[PDB]
């Protein structure tokens, strides 16, 4: 099989370089990065990969736009990996993800995809000690019904491996008044959750030490107060 | 009843006035919005509202979701939470980055009742003279249901009804076309377009057909059939 | 003329004995009411008809409303008329599949004899058959001068106020499935199927709504000739 | 394409399975079987199925199953209901619980599509019958949407042929009898009038050719309005 | 004294109104007739011949409209169910609907009785079966507390006996035998050993009594135990 | 000796065929199961060993009543495994237990064998059911006991019927959509005793009370 690997920080990243390395294992491996709903033009250019020669393209464009030319360039393509984004995309974070808009990019396009991301802040994300378990959830993954659309958060000491649900929080709207060094103020904006990630969560299964993987919905409907609104006699 | 008004077209954006005006007919209303992820700081500073009523207004230098925490801290406590009219469409697959439906689910975040409000661009643009009538029918329809409620709403330019809707879910075609711009360097045209058209009881079905589309939001992005 | 008289609710229920009198007024009636095509026994015993009318033939039956239909043409033949009613429950719409009371009047038509269904929709207040027998002997006449054989479903409002002719109403469905769990924390989903519009004019089910008196002819031929 | 099948025998009917083995080879399959329309409560169970495709035990009816089975399983494009063990031909599809579930599909916005064949004597060969199964899937599946068709397979199937439901006069045969223990009752045994004909369901079945015939919703006669 | 009058005939029977009339004559009667499941429950209209009875059609079983009954008309000190349309004997009680409503009183902490007569054949003639009826009340109300009876009143009672429940063998008698349209079917007639030893309930009603006999709820055989 | 199997679940219950496959270790198997009256039976294939089969259209009872004619003499019948439990007050009304009880009125040794989320795993409940079968062919004949076997048991254990007084517990309720109803969620006043066929299973144990046939309480009579 064949496989598009793209990523939302760069094609410099480290993270994009060791999920290619990793997606590697498991078929023909293709790359395609961003420089930094119409028609629109994108350019892209070739990229010598830094491991097992991968061709590569450095697009200057979006990550979707990577998806669709990866695609296009590299065709066919079995399934689309988006990562290892440096920084985690769990719970409320999925609705913005740029790793994550990247696979559901593929999903539409018909394929199968799967984000990846790792936590940052303090120790950098050491991809060898994480590349075992990095191999672990690709092996499981192509062993779902395809297509499948998935979200994994893998911590940065990874002990083992569980599907999750996203985690759902009501927040405090904590407005802090405050004044810079030179006198000018300002309000620190800082939303505490009103409680503890619930376990069978994304945000819960990192914080254990397991690697997180969320099936994601494409449909944002809540249905349970639609069909009700809906109904006749 | 108190509303806290935004957007994300920016304080001067005639689509955010026009919904604080009907939003006042149902409440008293206030103003905060953007200028053009953690613990961060924002600035923001009074401004007048335009010349119609007048209403306590904030132009924040920061996110639509800063608005959001920003109107509760300044006003609060609110009852609800309207962002908009969006000066273009947020329909189907749109959704998930919308900036105007980022600042409604804030407020719902918050325990609030919340909604955003669109009206389709890219040609012409919005009579609010018109849509007023309009507006004002869908707010007192929002304001009859159980609270709270998070509810994505689009407008078309000129409206004959109204129907709650689904999301329009579509797959897609990489459409990618080989050219050169006039000048002689080559490039890739990217034109995605849907396999099929959107199916009646959708936003984008409704919309299309001149009906204001009302579609209420899940928070949860987890496809539970997939997990079990 | 001779009336079979039967139903699918027992031998004991007034909705029974109501139709049987009021055909009683338009010739010799003859009930056979309850207590598969391989030949199989069916038992039945002579049953008194109450004492507060004129005492009519009848036939408790130990069988379906079908095997009443047969027993009843056997130990009462020959019957020009198959009357099956009156149901407490409604037979609308979707519902006229599943049907014990049509069943039993297509039995009758499929021994060539012409025969409608009566019901009465409940859930809630039982009717009232004093004020029902006006309409039961209105829509007797009106059924009587139609060409034989025929096939009718008839509903009628608790409190009628006219008649008409109608057509099956046929609506659209949404499967609302929404979850839920009883006093004691166990998990289950609550189920409740519905049509996505109201009733079209012209259907047994707007009739019924507006309180009118619904006919209905029906056919025993279930093949779409349109694909075909 | 996704497919949800289900049936009214139940999760172990053979039927069933060799259902939706056949419904595999075109889609996405998943299976909801058995064990009024006010609210009433519904409880599914996670079952193995024996391919794989994900199943559930419903505590419900069988249209039950297909509510069910599109809110844990769906969205899907068809419903598939059987094979039935037993026919479901003329005045029969009337009272079919294989096609009420069908019809609960159709009603829902779907395609659908009832499956059977006759019993009353030998077991049927379904892994002998996959060769029309699939047949007769491929045939429906190009068909123009929505449809709702009722399948009639013979044992030993010879071809195919869309169908008429066949529609007869009956006699109504009341003989009367006695149990052994000398108790009195009455046979009664309907027969029809005449043979099945050219072009009917019941007709085609007896040739030993694979039935189909489109069902119409609206029991109506308009010639009669 | 308040007593909740049930059955599992329906709401229409009347050998329902009929236990409810003399139930009345000792107390105050209200009535019910058809895991944690939802009941609905609608006002029903009691016969206006007799008396005015609160009462309520229950769209679940017997076993509902006890516990419904019991909530809506509480408190309630007897719980009478029947009189079932036809006989309630020997191996007949285990499976009874009139006495599992009476049972189900009984494990609520309520006395309860369940009465039938026989049908099949002829109509029981609750006017002529009302002397007896209120006489085997008198007694079943002067029994310890609580209390749970299987009663069986013969079309014309002459008398009364507190019976033991008959229990008989059986010879599995399977007579072959063939139907009109040709086909061959089996009559089973299972028919018992010995007759009916008197002091039993089928001996009683057999003789021309009414029988009433004390049940147990525990179906263990301690004895092997 | 000759061995009569059948259920309520019928002919395609793999309950059936194990309780079947189970009892061919002690004797000659013949099975009947459901799909003054007439009733119809049609030959059936069996899965696995090969077992004379036969489909009743008609009630459990009928099997075990057909199934004596047609492959009588028969010393023992067994029914089940049903898929469900059947314990305390549930043996009333159990047509697992129904059929064994026909055998029992017939003259001949009756069992009933039943397993209670998930599915039971029968290669695994194997070992259990012959271990209660033996059990069972040791007890003087004639004889009807009731049997329970956990998903995975972990002993076995000879137990009487759960007898407990409920507390009807009724709370008014209404479905999403508007109508109003009845919650009718009755529930036991204290927990199932030691001993007892319930308390027995579910503490992993397998259960078999013996049953009595009279429902005469004599200690009133």
């Not at 360039?73 to 740029?98: A, K, M, R, T």
């Not at 397991?210 to 107060?225: I, K, M, N, Y």
Request: hydrophobic content about 45%; proline content about 10%.
């Amino acid at each position: 099989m064949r496989i598009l690997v793209t990523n939302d920080d760069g094609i410099y990243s480290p993270g994009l370089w060791a999920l290619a390395e990793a997606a590697s294992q498991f078929g023909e491996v293709f790359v395609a990065a961003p420089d930094t709903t119409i028609a629109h033009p994108v350019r892209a250019y070739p990229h010598p990969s830094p491991a097992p020669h991968f061709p590569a393209y450095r697009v200057r464009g979006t990550p979707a736009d990577c998806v669709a030319l990866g695609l296009h360039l590299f065709g066919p393509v079995d399934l689309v990996l988006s990562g290892v984004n440096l920084g985690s995309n769990l719970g409320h974070e999925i609705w913005h993800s740029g790793t994550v808009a990247a696979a559901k990019q593929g999903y539409l396009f018909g394929l199968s995809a799967a984000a990846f991301s790792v936590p940052l802040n303090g120790e950098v994300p050491d991809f060898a000690g994480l590349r075992p378990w990095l191999l672990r959830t690709l092996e499981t993954l192509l062993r779902l019904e395809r297509p499948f659309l998935v979200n994994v958060n893998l911590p940065l000491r990874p002990k083992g491996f569980l599907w999750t649900r996203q985690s759902v929080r009501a927040y405090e709207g904590v407005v802090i008044p405050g004044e810079d060094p030179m006198g000018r103020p300002f309000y620190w904006f800082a939303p505490r959750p009103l409680k503890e990630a619930e376990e069978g969560t994304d945000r819960w299964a990192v914080a254990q030490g397991f690697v997180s993987a969320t099936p994601l919905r494409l449909d944002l409907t809540d249905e349970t107060r639609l069909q009700p609104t809906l109904a006749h006699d």
